[PDB]
Design a protein around this ligand. Structure first.
Ligand code: GNB
Ligand code: GNB
Ligand code: ZN
Ligand code: ZN
Lengths: 176, 183
């Protein structure tokens, strides 16, 4: 069965002083087509492209997306890099050059075998109004808010089919 | 030239051409979690809290569906509310949390293991933690028996590391104030 609350806590340790100031900075996902992904994360989800890095020899680019005010992005190159990479909760989208031309290529979202990663999740003020707008924009849904068992929780998909949970923190406790 | 050239990297201009300003309806959206399935929650809780210094900020159990959820984050333990409902609203409104999904029974199934996304079929790559000193953090990780994908001075990007958790998910260990002098 599951762990009890006491057992789970016994498995946890206090933060060592050496981990002071550590922060969970990014989640990296590979994207087939950066044009489609950038449109989705900025226009549909409202994130900001805070940094773009290109690696010509290794043939890939990185796009960092985050919920930051665009006016906070530093102008200087090195300051910009340090600022973007010290923001909490960023998405690092990796574009391996040439995948958009390969009709037989697609990335795996982790929700069918083999499974592992499941989804990223965005907290919103109102799951119903967010999803009504997503519907109007033609967003693909795994789960609309009242579909299935948990009412008021949704799962949408990005252009690669990665699942994105849409949740209201103040309604999670009464889910079902 | 005649044939349509292969797609390559986007120019900075091409990338910005696909970006739209944020609609006001999304102004309070936040990136709250990354969900990873874990084979054994005991090993994962020990790793994330003892090795990486994260805090268990919420635990959820779903008896009928036979799974539990463990939320880990870099939060002060004293900020965790006492009441069950207040605790949930607070934990699920924190930015940058990890949601660990334990499907009951995987820990005793010797034929089972999750996939980390870095071998066929690929998708997800890694999570990343920003630290003040990659070399000192990785020296400690080595002392603790942490599995590495890339030590700080391994490969071309010196000063950047990748470690793995109990399920083999990759975790980047980076110092944001030195990333600009990489390459
Ligand atoms: N073919 C690869 C491409 C992605 C890739 O190679 N990423 C590398 C870290 S980049 C990186 O180090 O990031 C460097 C940087 C980022 C952002 C900035 N900035 O803020 O501007 C500046 C510099 C990597 O994973 N190395 C680990 C290993 O396999 O051992 C893939 O995963 O599909
Ligand atoms: N066998 C599954 C288990 C994990 C699982 O099913 N999680 C579901 C969201 S629970 C959830 O969203 O959350 C319900 C809740 C969480 C936290 C709190 N809280 O903070 O107390 C309260 C309530 C999910 O992925 N649903 C989409 C689908 O499969 O169609 C798997 O993915 O491996
Ligand atoms: Zn990364
Ligand atoms: Zn989730």
């Amino acid at each position: 069965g599951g762990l009890t609350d006491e057992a789970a806590l016994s498995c946890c340790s206090d933060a060592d002083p050496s981990t002071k100031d550590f922060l969970l900075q990014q989640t990296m996902l590979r994207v087939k087509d950066p044009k489609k992904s950038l449109d989705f994360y900025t226009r549909v989800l409202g994130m900001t492209l805070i940094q773009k890095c290109d690696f010509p020899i290794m043939k890939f680019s990185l796009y960092f997306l985050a919920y930051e005010d665009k006016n906070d992005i530093p102008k200087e190159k090195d300051e910009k890099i340090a600022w973007a990479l010290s923001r909490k909760a960023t998405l690092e989208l990796t574009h391996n050059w040439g995948t958009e031309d390969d009709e037989t290529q697609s990335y795996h979202n982790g929700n069918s075998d083999p499974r592992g990663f499941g989804h990223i999740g965005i907290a919103v003020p109102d799951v119903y109004s967010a999803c009504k707008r997503f519907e109007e924009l033609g967003v693909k849904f795994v789960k609309k808010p009242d579909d299935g068992k948990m009412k008021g929780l949704a799962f949408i998909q990005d252009p690669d089919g990665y699942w994105i949970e849409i949740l209201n923190p103040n309604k999670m406790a009464t889910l079902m």
